[PDB]
Amino acid sequence: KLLLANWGLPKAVLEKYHSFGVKKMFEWQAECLLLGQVLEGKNLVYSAPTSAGKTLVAELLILKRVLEMRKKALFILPFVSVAKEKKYYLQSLFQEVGIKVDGYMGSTSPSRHFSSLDIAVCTIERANGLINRLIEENKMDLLGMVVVDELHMLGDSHRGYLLELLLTKICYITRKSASSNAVQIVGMSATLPNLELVASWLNAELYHTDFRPVPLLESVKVGNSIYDSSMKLVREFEPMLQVEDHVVSLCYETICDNHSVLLFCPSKKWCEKLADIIAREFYNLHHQAEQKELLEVMDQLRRLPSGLDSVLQKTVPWGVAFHHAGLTFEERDIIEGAFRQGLIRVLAATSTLSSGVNLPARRVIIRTPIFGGRPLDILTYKQMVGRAGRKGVDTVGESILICKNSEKSKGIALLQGSLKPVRSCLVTGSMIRAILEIIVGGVASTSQDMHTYAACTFLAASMGAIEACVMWLLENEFIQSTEKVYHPTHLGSATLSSSLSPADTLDIFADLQRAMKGFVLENDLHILYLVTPMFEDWTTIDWYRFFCLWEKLPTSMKRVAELVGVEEGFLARCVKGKQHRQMAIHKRFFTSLVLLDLISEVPLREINQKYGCNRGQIQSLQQSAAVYAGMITVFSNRLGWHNMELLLSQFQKRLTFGIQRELCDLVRVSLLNAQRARVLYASGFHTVADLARANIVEVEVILKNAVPMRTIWVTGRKGLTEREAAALIVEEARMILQQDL
Amino acid sequence: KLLLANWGLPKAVLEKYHSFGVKKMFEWQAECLLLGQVLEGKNLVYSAPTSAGKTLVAELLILKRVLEMRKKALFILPFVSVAKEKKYYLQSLFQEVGIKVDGYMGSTSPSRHFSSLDIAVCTIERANGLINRLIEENKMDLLGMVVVDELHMLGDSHRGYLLELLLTKICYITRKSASSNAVQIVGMSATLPNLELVASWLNAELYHTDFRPVPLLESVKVGNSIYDSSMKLVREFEPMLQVEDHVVSLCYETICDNHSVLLFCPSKKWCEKLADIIAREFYNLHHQAEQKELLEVMDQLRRLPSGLDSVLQKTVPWGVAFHHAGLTFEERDIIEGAFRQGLIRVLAATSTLSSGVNLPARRVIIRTPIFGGRPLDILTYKQMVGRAGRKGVDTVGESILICKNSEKSKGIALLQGSLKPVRSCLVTGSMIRAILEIIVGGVASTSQDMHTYAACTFLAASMGAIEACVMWLLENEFIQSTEKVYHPTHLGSATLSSSLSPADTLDIFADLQRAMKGFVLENDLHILYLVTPMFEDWTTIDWYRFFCLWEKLPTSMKRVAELVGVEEGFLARCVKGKQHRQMAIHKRFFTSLVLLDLISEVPLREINQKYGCNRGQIQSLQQSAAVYAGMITVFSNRLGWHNMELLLSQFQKRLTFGIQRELCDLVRVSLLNAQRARVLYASGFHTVADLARANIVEVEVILKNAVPMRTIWVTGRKGLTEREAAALIVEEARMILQQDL
Ligand SMILES: COc1ccccc1-c1ccncc1C(=O)Nc1nnc(OCc2ccc(Cl)cc2)s1
Ligand SMILES: COc1ccccc1-c1ccncc1C(=O)Nc1nnc(OCc2ccc(Cl)cc2)s1
């Protein structure tokens, strides 16, 4: 029975699955897919190692709930990078059968309407908003499927509560129409202890497996000795060519057998240092002093807005490199592709890669059990060591955690530890959000229904607050009480529409209302201070640098600075030689200055030099700001603020792509980010109309010029040759202008 | 030879001309059209009575310069009403042959680009801007024809100088490429003395005729005696049924022969009184106390935003009525159509109708020679008395000017007077505008060329200033001087682009620049104070009323009022119980309040009641404000002001149609002004897409409802039946959404 052809499956999807290598399932997937009425709608909650092909069952169930019972489906993923990778994977897997798959990730939204879509690959943040939209204007009948990758995220997380709110709201909808399902829910999780609780909460069937196609050997390293998980010595490591940790010797031993290695370091500078070191030894140890593919990778990295990196330049032409959050998303994807193809053999990465893309390595060396001054998380450790072993290539996979002295204790604790149980995280902001979501959607009106809703949440399954939440929403004019039936107000409806926390929406309302009274239209800084999310921790602000920039602003910026709350007596002044709101204003002013250079098309390296923030932080900030701009635009649209929504309607795109207004029509093309559109705009093409018939060979020449074979790198298309790149550019322009009218 | 078939002419245009009755030309038209090389391009300047078919030669020459030498053409007309009538006339005459004819009048602009057009029926104000646009971005080769109706307007006028600037600029272009024409110029004028001078100035051939198809008998009336033009008694008038002027007796005598009468009064109240009087007598004198078509006219007047008029209600169902500027444009057109069809037999009109549409009456009675406290203009008198006599119906036409005592002297002076010679009207604002127009267009650079240009104007043909104009443009940063070659600046380029006087553009620049620093986005009043043209004399502002409105403004308006300069200590206060800029601000604030109710879709009668300004003044103000809004939008667009042009980009439409934002897509339909779109919007149609397939019979029912056979009145379509009206509405929506993509 274990064969993808025996199971009912489209021929096109079957032949696409044979391309990636999936031709015979495992026993665990069959036992999970044949777990009673799961194929009919009885929700499903299952756990498996990430290397065991967890998502195959989810994709099969989607194809089912989409083909047989034609309806929409949601694929909720934890992060934007993995969500985009899954969106492109599902697109390449489902294009032939005609299932329109599009993504709601970060700032990007599908050009086509959600009604035209058939699968929405969403982040946790945007899937909740999508379901809120479906509930508001009565379309919950379109949804028939919801898939939640990384179900364990529903516990303690900054975006996990939105996951719970996503399901407890759906289940109520299914359990209020009952006065094998109407909306199926399929969840993928890790080896959680209380998975059952989660399975019973969602009524889903529970499937837990521990099968790993490539066996895993986790071990600790103390001095020169290697011990297994159960405090048993397994090997006496002796360095081959070393100049205790012998990290370089371990990497050398891994490399000698024509394999690759993952090296998880606790910081960025540590990754850059511990990739330089192995590069130096691989030169000296291997030169007594594919290439072509590696030179292609170097040239791909060299035609980027930030260009080549000095440490990358020293490391990459030896098989060694580093992959941390400091690099741009393009550089990170290039390095990840190079490692995936075997071109890069040693990858010094941080913990961020552990939860990100699927990047398996033969040996995973975790330098220290102490990550960022704290012991490594058991979930993080499991995520790292689950990458040890490539399916279908390696016979085994090795994880080596390097510990010492006392550190040995934390290492053995990580070796013998297990995942913590899932939580609920639900007065509190999450419960306020949930109460507002149900009341404003009209799904629940009376307080008896309000407690019934809380009887459907994970808190009720794990085993007052709702009254406090209702009181808070009533006292803050989010909700009105009539003979005590609760009805949404205009502010309460606008909060649920623009997907913002009701806690933040109060100050957002105050800030926008103050901005309407006095606005500065002679720059884009006032329209940016409103769409600037916060400071958070996107960078470590240098006070002197800030004051210097401020001393050199146009004769019109400081007008915007003083109209929003910034000062000069406290503007990188007092803090220069050394208040919770003024700090949040200046740290928002600086943040709004950086975005000012992002929408002014300033090169990332120049922004880094003038502001001191690296390019990864700048890109993260611009993505967050674009999301916030979209939310603020919807908030003003639903409040009847036509003179502000009109101003904000373009800044989401101008921040997503970091462009000027002129390119806002060119960047609609998927392959025109901010530099293949500026060089294509200077040559006279200023509209997607002039680019549909743009001379093919002409745009090839233009893309060949202006360099900061497949040197051009495209997000989701990896590397593209100039000719193929601009051919796809003109084809995308043709499709955009042809299917939008 | 005198036959429209013998002349080379399209068969479709010939059969369309036979519809209006034009089947045999006069001798004067043949002698003017065969005046040497006029048919080849030698410009043409000719004079004829307005009843002699002056424009036939112009239309024939256009068809020529359009069919043979395919190129664009301009039809410059003095006013918006006559320009629109001519646009619809030329459209109905030229649709079959395929000559795309569209109008640049007031605020409306063609949906299609000027390149697609073949005839542009423009006002004098907008034709100059069109020619400036053609000269700027090098398209003067498209223009090959320019037709100027009412050439005598080029002298002393508020829009006449723009006419001269229109031609002296063209001639230079033709006479600078010479270092039978490249742009033909055809002018129609009245019996001017210095026509020759104008003919030689434009190099045009001169044709003057005095032929009138219906002979005219002008006479003066003193007491009971009627004297001819040369102080000779012609008839001893005796009233038939009178209760000296015997105006009513004269109207009765005209009516008894089943004819109609035009009665030109010096004011609006006089027209309303002297139509009520003849209505009263036509009831009492004719009732000892077509109908169906007249009841149709009453119902047409009753389904208007202002509804029926009390004086109109008393007068119209007797054949008598009044036509003054106080009425709406729709009411004026309805009354003019009723008089033209013979339904209305006595029309008490003001001097405004004299220069407007072609409305002939058998007898034209001019009550008094003193019009508005001053003697009647000889041009105005000729314009009035040229309407005496319908071609093809009457055998003669009669003009009767009622004078008395001393007034007799001014009456005989008008009888024996003649038209004053044409002037030039060119430091002065016109010469500044002309110098800026040539320099910024790049057509002239050196001061030698600058004096050469002034050697091409009408001043040079009638027989220092240019140096003063250049100095003024240099000292005001409109123009820069290099090694002394004059180049346009950004402000100088923006002034020529947005078609505003350089005198006004300085204060406009200052006002917009001040508005960018602090703007109020929570209402539309700040975006309206910038697009409010001026006070001029559009109304007589009532101070108490203004202060009352101000005492009752939202909690956000007075914010806009104090941000622009308005006060409360001087805001219908001091002037209430009884400074050239503060007067221009408050009179702009009040004007910006009225427009606020126009874009809020307040009914015209409610605006009239709350502000004290009649509906004709309100409509004139809204048209002027829409023109100003378009000019300001272009001015900000060319100055790189993206945050202001975006705000202003919709107010031109919102003021042209007096609508809200929601209807800005519906009013793109030619038959949806502001009340056939609001009632069609409330039923769910909020987009021109929902109206293309809008159920035909459904929109018929919706238009049948909401009444404030052909009751629906459409501008340019006269009266339309509900079924035909909404059928044309859905057809226009289909065309709009089908040909715009
Ligand atoms: C505020 O909404 C944003 C808009 C722009 C960018 C980011 C956000 C955002 C930010 C932070 N968290 C969440 C969101 C979010 O996506 N909320 C959404 N709500 N509705 C959406 O459209 C989906 C949709 C539309 C129509 C139908 Cl019929 C069905 C589904 S997205
Ligand atoms: C400022 O321009 C306004 C815009 C809106 C409404 C009123 C005005 C206005 C107001 C007062 N006086 C004059 C104008 C005026 O029409 N100026 C114009 N200039 N260019 C135009 O377009 C014609 C055109 C366009 C492209 C080509 Cl290739 C050739 C011709 S219109």
UniProtKB/Swiss-Prot annotation, chains A, B:
Residues 35-210 form the Helicase ATP-binding domain. ATP binds at residues 29, 48-55. Changing residue 54 to M: Abolished ATPase activity. GO terms for cellular component: cytosol; Golgi apparatus; mitochondrial nucleoid; nucleoplasm; nucleus; site of DNA damage; site of double-strand break. It comes from Homo sapiens (Human). Low-fidelity DNA polymerase with a helicase activity that promotes microhomology-mediated end-joining (MMEJ), an alternative non-homologous end-joining (NHEJ) machinery required to repair double-strand breaks in DNA during mitosis. MMEJ is an error-prone repair pathway that produces deletions of sequences from the strand being repaired and promotes genomic rearrangements, such as telomere fusions, some of them leading to cellular transformation. MMEJ is required during mitosis to repair persistent double-strand breaks that originate in S-phase. Residues 244-454 form the Helicase C-terminal domain. Keywords: Acetylation, ATP-binding, Chromosome, DNA damage, DNA repair, DNA-directed DNA polymerase, Helicase, Hydrolase, Multifunctional enzyme, Nucleotide-binding, Nucleotidyltransferase, Nucleus, Phosphoprotein, Transferase. The chain holds residues 68 to 891 of 2590 of the full protein. This is DNA polymerase theta.
